[PDB]
Design a protein around this ligand. Structure first.
Ligand SMILES: OC[C@@H]1O[C@@H](OC[C@@H]2O[C@@H](OC[C@@H]3O[C@H](O)[C@H](O)[C@H]3O)[C@H](O)[C@H]2O)[C@H](O)[C@H]1O
Ligand SMILES: [Ca+2]
Length: 314
């Protein structure tokens, strides 16, 4: 994946029993040179770095504070937390999308920050505030949070996002601005078909002509009472229709469960999928039943069966 490069590494031959600073919620990963980076929900977007991918250490944050334009979309937040960042590399620039919102509301906005590099040791390092990308108001039937960018095979960039309300959205982005055209159409591509509509954190990857939409089912943010589950569906075309192993549409509650968690790692959710050669990994957070339900970073190798469906190794 050109926008999610990982050099010459085989994820299947790596040790993924993490150590270090592992507190994380809604993580994504990137690798530049010999450094690994994890971005996740928190004050101005939290950052962690690693030399091997096993030992992680906190590495500050993207923004010192919240850009002033946030107030145009979200009531004064005594909170300085930015949610669910997404990272991709395009034309020598790193694009970091993130969310600004208030828990339980859809008065939200997805912003964009760019940088020439992820390494603060490099003089070119500077996270630039490139403003809002797309937003939602209380009157809209979608929620503008949980962004994820994916370039289809044709090299066309797309932004998927959404949490509750009508569900998962999809919209084309322009290659020049990496923001949707003013007239781009917003497409709904997945929904539990229930009320509330507990589906969020979309992440799309293309593998052998198929587009896989990974999403999070049910509830986050409740410690040991979280019920998050990772589900997946696929489509021949990026616009859909995405369907699960049973042929059921993801617009009607369809979705093949990849991980529902257990009594030790509660509600695994908000995943990210990355490739390297034939290997792949699944990244997400899960609540630690042994540590007061604290959100913990998880990275596991992700395999694929002969029928083309993903599955985490035992
Ligand atoms: O930091 C994690 C963050 O939260 C995830 O979604 C949780 C929030 O609740 C969602 O809506 C819950 C309820 O459903 C109805 O629509 C009610 O009106 C509403 O309160 C919101 O979309 C989220 O703010 C996100 O996936 C993740 O970014
Ligand atoms: Ca995400």
């Amino acid at each position: 994946v050109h926008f999610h490069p990982f050099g010459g590494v085989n994820f299947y031959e790596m040790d993924w029993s993490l150590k270090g600073d592992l507190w994380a919620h809604d993580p994504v990963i990137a690798k530049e040179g010999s450094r690994w980076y994890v971005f996740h929900t928190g004050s101005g977007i939290q950052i962690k770095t690693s030399e091997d991918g096993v030992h992680w250490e906190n590495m500050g944050w993207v923004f010192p504070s919240l850009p002033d334009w946030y107030k145009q979309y979200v009531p004064e937040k005594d909170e300085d937390h930015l949610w669910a960042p997404d990272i991709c590399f395009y034309n020598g620039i790193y694009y970091l999308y993130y969310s600004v919102s208030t828990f339980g509301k859809n008065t939200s906005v997805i912003g964009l920050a760019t940088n020439q590099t992820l390494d603060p040791r490099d003089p070119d390092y500077e996270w630039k505030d490139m403003g809002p990308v797309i937003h939602s108001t209380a009157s809209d039937n979608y929620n503008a949070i949980d962004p994820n960018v994916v370039f289809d095979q044709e090299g066309q960039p797309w932004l998927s996002f959404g949490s509750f309300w009508s569900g998962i959205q999809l919209i084309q982005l322009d290659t020049e601005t990496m923001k949707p055209a003013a007239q781009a159409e917003l497409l709904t591509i997945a929904s539990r078909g229930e009320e509330p509509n507990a589906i969020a954190a979309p992440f799309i990857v293309c593998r052998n002509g198929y587009y896989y939409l990974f999403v999070s089912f049910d509830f986050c943010c409740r410690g040991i009472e979280s019920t998050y589950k990772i589900a997946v569906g696929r489509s021949k075309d990026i616009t859909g229709p995405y369907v699960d192993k049973n042929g059921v549409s993801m617009m009607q509650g369809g979705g093949t469960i990849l991980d529902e968690g257990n009594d030790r790692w509660i509600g695994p959710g908000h995943c990210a999928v990355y490739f390297s050669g034939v290997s792949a990994i699944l990244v997400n957070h899960a609540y630690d039943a042994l540590k007061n339900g604290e959100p913990t970073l998880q990275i596991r190798p992700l395999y694929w069966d002969d029928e083309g469906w993903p599955y985490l190794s035992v």
